[model samples]
Target: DKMVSKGEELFTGVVPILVELDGDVNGHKFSVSGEGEGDATYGKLTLKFILTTGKLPVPWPTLVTTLVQCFSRYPDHMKQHDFFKSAMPEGYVQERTIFFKDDGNYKTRAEVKFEGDTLVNRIELKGIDFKEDGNILGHKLEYNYNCHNVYIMADKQKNGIKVNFKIRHNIEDGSVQLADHYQQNTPIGDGPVLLPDNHYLSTQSALSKDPNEKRDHMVLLEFVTAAGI
Candidate 1:
């Protein structure tokens, strides 16, 4: 059994994860793996994954074309937007204010819940929003937790395109071993897409063997894309 813990942290046994892709996206396959560390309190927890083999999907159309297409497909747009609005029970939305900053940076707070047969959890998005030309020429968003912060950035270039995602979770002095096992395939439109079957953003326990190791946490993300769609 893979286990580790400390203090009064909860012990949730190992959750296995299986790599499965619903359908090949642009003749490409996807998978994820990583490691990192943190505790029960606020410190600094970081997770990194180096995709040495394949590249992830970077879906970015011209600003005008994107806007036009999004507007043209009203029904499709509504369905997609509805998913985001209704994904969480409470729903996620931007904080509307009278006097707001128009520099393309918005901030909002919410509770993101995740449900599993054996594991149910939620994480705090204290500050989450995207900015134009904030950290990159394209766009960037940050999901901030008391102990963790996730950064997602996408940029397009002549030679090649790249997307970078980083998660830094700051927590107290403890240990956690997040096990995930499952695989699934869901449809989002023209073709079906594969998704993580069984998993939790973070699973805490004191039984982790490498509690005191330099690298306490990590994660990997896979993206598959082709010439079109």
Candidate 2:
């Protein structure tokens, strides 16, 4: 058997995620935002936002019609090419591995896959200690979220559309593999959508391989559109 430390409880709550974006993808100007909550001691944390311009509430009609028209001059052929191919020749599944810091200095490996209109990411954690029964406390973590949408507009011609993310997995680190339902209202609506209960956001864990790696734990994130762009 592979030598592994059973996952133990180390730090809890307050997952910090900072977001920055260029020309609004979902209509609302999303420049920067701090999402997630915990306590000074690990209890309550609020999602703070900042707007580049005067940041006013976007009207549904504007957002809806605008969502239907972010930029009239967009790549047509490129948008039709779904980033997936399950078979041979011209198509193949796209899988990527990302090794990055999760806790303090520990490296976390994430396997990402884009299948059709869905996303699958399995996060592999480092050395986790054990429980009293000898079973691994926290080990495998996975995120399987559907309704994957992207704005393939001409906006990317400038700085381009991209995501800036910070995450520390706690649930799959201590609980189990988890996936959520379609959180957004859909075709006519763009997120700033709230998960029914912040299901994944509410998970708390105080365990990391390195005791010195004292970063707040956060697992899943709401499909970011624009709360404070």
Against the reference, the lDDT scores of all candidates come to 0.20, 0.22
lDDT of 2 by residue, 67-137 (tens): 10111111222222211111101112111112223311211233333233222222322222222222112
CA RMSD, predictions in order: 19.5, 22.6
Q: Which segments of model 1 are wrong by more than 4 Å? A: 1-7, 10-27, 59-229
Provide the lowest-lDDT 10-residue window in model 1: 62-71
TM-score of 1: 0.20
Clashes of each: 29, 19
